[PDB]
Design a protein around this ligand. Structure first.
Ligand SMILES: [Zn+2]
Ligand SMILES: [Zn+2]
Lengths: 73, 94, 370
């Protein structure tokens, strides 16, 4: 497991068996388990809005938490 | 041989700098905005307004950004790169 | 109440007397679904001539450049009551100017219900949704196989109130919005508007393919007028009825007055030989007994079809239309340019709202009707 790509994000590297060839890193599999998948548009359109909606609702949550602490005090 | 107090974020301070907002090469760029960080993700933004009375008034925001902010820096054209222990994020003031 | 025993509580619930002599109030003030800290110390008597008013640093931010206004308000104000009425009125003003900080959606209603209604449509339709999810844009097809978009703008409560519906096509789009109506309702309405123009789009696409369209250039779906060119240095501008497109349009001629005469005269003879079974082009070719050229654009890429007064095309919407009644000049001009030329000279002679004069280039009689 490391970032072999030079994206920033770690990936996992999987080496399948030595019966295929008497050689290292033949029959590989590199994956991030998200987007990135390397080996030997309405789905992927509408995620960032939803995620930013989560983060804004998170900031509102965080805000009201702080407000309430003050009120109690 | 005096000391003045300006704003007071309630949470600890991490980063102080400046930006060139309204960017309309030379190294010393005459900075338009002023930036400071809190940790719990309070960001302070300052600018010159000179509006509605025809007199200079300091336009403050206070943003409440996600994540415990660990570090930040400034880049060319009113851009700040800051980091949460999740992700490295960026902010455009410009 | 009359007295600020009760009127203070009734107008500022969140102002609690700490000291026995009601002299230090503290706690909060309400303001546009937003409560703020306050710590408002009076002197040993009830006087606002001298008073300490300390705040949240959050409150100092929102009372930006009213520090002096409120200092005035403290010394000129009778009672603490009246001061608080003003400080509320004033916060409401400060924040309604700074109105770009507000608006959290209701997540249990919105994000899901919106995912639900888009599932109702189908996922192949959606083309754009803003990261605020405020704007979205959707796609539909005509029976012809033409893409027609619809922009929506959404409120904090989408299903309650109407979403603002923006769309190119020229007849005014009407969306019967109820709180019960959804994306699928307005989508069916959108398809209804597409098909009422289905014959109309075909007539327009036909003209745009086979003829030298001049004066919409990449026309939208909103354009009902089509300035076609024919030969060179004569044009026809054509407005079509969208409900009867195949039917006879109002059409008329621009150019040299010796060239327009037989064309108008032959249109008047052959306008009864219009038939709405054929296309607009297949009726015009047999009415006016002509062909149209296929984009004399690429061969005549600089024929200087500019005003030849100001040397620009597109002066303030106007086109080079006014020409010379001469075979050797044929020089187009603008209404504004030719008028400011023929009025300036001595020689020029005006009947009522006409100027007769000399063409600038060739000095032959040219007529301008304003
Ligand atoms: Zn002109
Ligand atoms: Zn002439």
């Amino acid at each position: 497991i490391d970032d072999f790509i030079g994206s920033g994000t770690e990936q996992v590297l999987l080496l399948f068996k030595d019966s295929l060839n008497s050689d290292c890193l033949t029959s590989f599999k590199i994956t991030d388990l998200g987007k990135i998948n390397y080996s030997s548009e309405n789905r992927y359109l509408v995620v960032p809005p939803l995620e930013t909606g989560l983060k804004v609702c998170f900031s509102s949550f965080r805000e009201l938490r702080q407000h309430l602490l003050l009120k109690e005090k | 041989t005096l000391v003045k107090i300006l704003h007071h974020l309630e949470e600890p301070v991490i980063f102080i700098g400046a930006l060139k907002t309204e960017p309309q090469p030379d190294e010393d760029v005459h900075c338009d905005c002023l930036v400071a960080f809190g940790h719990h993700g309070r960001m302070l933004a300052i600018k010159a307004s000179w509006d509605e009375s025809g007199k200079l008034v300091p336009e403050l925001r206070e943003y409440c950004l996600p994540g415990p902010v660990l570090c930040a820096a400034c880049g060319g054209g009113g851009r700040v790169y800051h980091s949460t222990p999740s992700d490295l994020c960026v902010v455009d003031l410009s | 109440m009359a007295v600020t025993e009760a009127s203070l509580l009734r107008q500022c619930p969140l102002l609690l007397p700490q000291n026995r002599s009601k002299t230090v109030y503290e706690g909060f003030i309400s303001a546009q679904g937003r409560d703020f800290h306050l710590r408002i110390v009076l002197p040993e008597d009830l006087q606002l001539k001298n008073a300490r008013l300390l705040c949240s640093w959050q409150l100092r931010t929102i009372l930006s450049g009213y520090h002096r206004i409120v200092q005035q308000r403290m010394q000129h104000s009778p009672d603490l009551m009246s001061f608080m009425m003003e400080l509320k009125m004033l916060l409401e003003v400060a924040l309604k100017n700074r109105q770009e900080l507000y608006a959290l959606p209701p997540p249990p209603q919105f994000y899901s219900s919106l995912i639900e209604e888009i599932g109702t449509l189908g996922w192949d339709k959606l083309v754009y949704a803003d990261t605020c999810f405020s704007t979205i844009k959707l796609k539909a097809e005509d029976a012809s196989g033409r893409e027609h978009l619809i922009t929506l703008k959404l409120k904090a409560k989408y299903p309650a109130e109407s979403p603002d519906y923006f769309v190119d096509f020229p007849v005014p789009f009407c969306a019967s919005w109820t709180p019960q109506s959804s994306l699928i309702s307005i989508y069916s309405q959108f398809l209804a508007a597409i098909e009422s123009l289905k014959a109309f789009w075909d007539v327009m696409d036909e003209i745009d393919e086979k003829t030298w369209v001049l004066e919409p250039e990449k026309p939208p779906r909103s354009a009902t007028a089509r300035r076609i060119a024919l030969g060179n240095n004569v044009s026809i501008n054509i407005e079509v009825d969208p409900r009867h497109p195949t039917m006879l349009p109002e059409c008329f001629f621009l150019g040299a007055d010796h060239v327009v005469k037989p064309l108008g005269i032959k249109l008047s003879r052959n306008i009864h030989l219009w038939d709405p079974e054929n296309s607009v082009l297949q009726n015009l070719k047999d009415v006016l007994e002509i062909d149209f050229p296929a984009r004399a654009i690429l061969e005549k890429s600089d024929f200087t079809m500019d005003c030849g007064i100001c040397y620009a095309y597109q002066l303030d919407g106007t086109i080079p239309d006014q020409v010379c009644d001469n075979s050797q000049c044929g020089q187009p001009f603008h209404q504004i340019c030719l008028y400011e030329w023929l009025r300036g000279l001595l020689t020029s002679r005006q009947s009522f709202n006409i100027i007769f004069g000399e063409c600038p280039y060739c000095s032959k009689p040219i007529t301008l009707k304003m």
